[PDB]
């Protein structure tokens, strides 16, 4: 049931100094960070990540947003991590996100793009594609978190 | 003036899930993360980092400790960042660290090595050496944090 999903702490979150708070939510949930790095995505890489939206009118503004400042890309590993992280993220537009979720607690204001604090892979297929896009195998690790032994099935 | 210093969130902090808590303390202080990545330090790199202790009896334990699991290395930028981060870290041995500091609030137990949650450059000279050891220029960025404009 263990899966890996990709999260991007977007420019709005980095600029607002929310990197730590976001990471803590994943850590306290029990999710494991197996890869992470601060990078500054250029347009070419951004367009590859959002390739499915290439033909849509909001594409340009989305690329402008994700490349505005450096971001933190990270890979989270855990039981049903893909759907669990999406749930933790909350509704796409922060105004609709429930209190308690990352977007619900930290997001609201928007620019030309719907700034929503973080990106979370929408499926296992997308996660695999996205993780391969941003990380090299040597940048992903297998190691124990403190309580891993407790769950030895 | 503005300085850059190196911080390593050590294996004990990573294993205990304290990465976010630690980073938040730097962010709320006003410090800017200009570089960061999770890496698993190899013995040779660890020995370069701790080169000053190569001839000491506690050297091996230090290497075993810092390479036990992946760590998060990051570069913090800000006014007098080197001394400020050292102050935030607290006493070397967590048992002696004051409440309110990172080591004071999160560290205590030790192994063969004095596990102390994080590493913080001890001087501007050490900071420059350490930053170059773990980061390439292309991995460090210049960008605005939300309130940067306020201090103009």
UniProtKB/Swiss-Prot annotation, chain B:
Its cofactor is Mg(2+). Disulfide bonds: none annotated. Its EC number is 2.7.4.6. SMART domains: NDK. One of its GO terms (biological process) is CTP biosynthetic process. InterPro entries: NDK-like_dom (IPR034907), NDK-like_dom_sf (IPR036850), Nucleoside_diP_kinase (IPR001564), Nucleoside_diP_kinase_AS (IPR023005). GO terms for molecular function: ATP binding; metal ion binding; nucleoside diphosphate kinase activity. The active site is at residue 119. Its main location: cytoplasm. It catalyses: a 2'-deoxyribonucleoside 5'-diphosphate + ATP = a 2'-deoxyribonucleoside 5'-triphosphate + ADP; a ribonucleoside 5'-diphosphate + ATP = a ribonucleoside 5'-triphosphate + ADP. ATP binds at residues 10, 58, 86, 92, 103. It is an enzyme of class 2 (transferase). Keywords: ATP-binding, Cytoplasm, Kinase, Magnesium, Metal-binding, Nucleotide metabolism, Nucleotide-binding, Phosphoprotein, Transferase. PROSITE patterns: NDPK, NDPK_LIKE. It is found in: Cytoplasm. GO terms for cellular component: cytoplasm. NCBIfam families: PRK00668.1. Belongs to the NDK family. Major role in the synthesis of nucleoside triphosphates other than ATP. The ATP gamma phosphate is transferred to the NDP beta phosphate via a ping-pong mechanism, using a phosphorylated active-site intermediate. This is Nucleoside diphosphate kinase. It comes from Pyrococcus horikoshii (strain ATCC 700860 / DSM 12428 / JCM 9974 / NBRC 100139 / OT-3). The lineage of its organism: Archaea, Methanobacteriati, Methanobacteriota, Thermococci, Thermococcales. The gene is ndk.
């Amino acid at each position: 049931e263990t899966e890996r999903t990709l999260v991007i702490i977007k420019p709005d979150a980095v600029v607002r100094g929310l990197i730590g708070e976001i990471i803590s939510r994943f850590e306290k949930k029990g999710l494991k960070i197996v890869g992470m790095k601060m990078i500054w995505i250029d347009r070419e890489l951004a367009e590859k990540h959002y390739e499915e939206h290439r033909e849509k009118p909001f594409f340009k503004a989305l690329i402008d947003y994700i490349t505005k400042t450096p971001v933190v890309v990270m890979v989270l590993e855990g039981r049903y991590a893909v759907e669990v992280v999406r749930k933790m993220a909350g509704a796409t537009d922060p105004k609709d996100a429930a209190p308690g979720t990352i977007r619900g607690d930290f997001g609201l204001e928007v620019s030309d793009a719907i700034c929503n604090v973080i990106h979370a892979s929408d499926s296992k297929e997308s996660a695999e594609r996205e993780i391969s896009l941003f990380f090299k195998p040597e940048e992903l690790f297998e190691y124990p978190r403190a309580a891993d032994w407790f769950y030895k099935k």
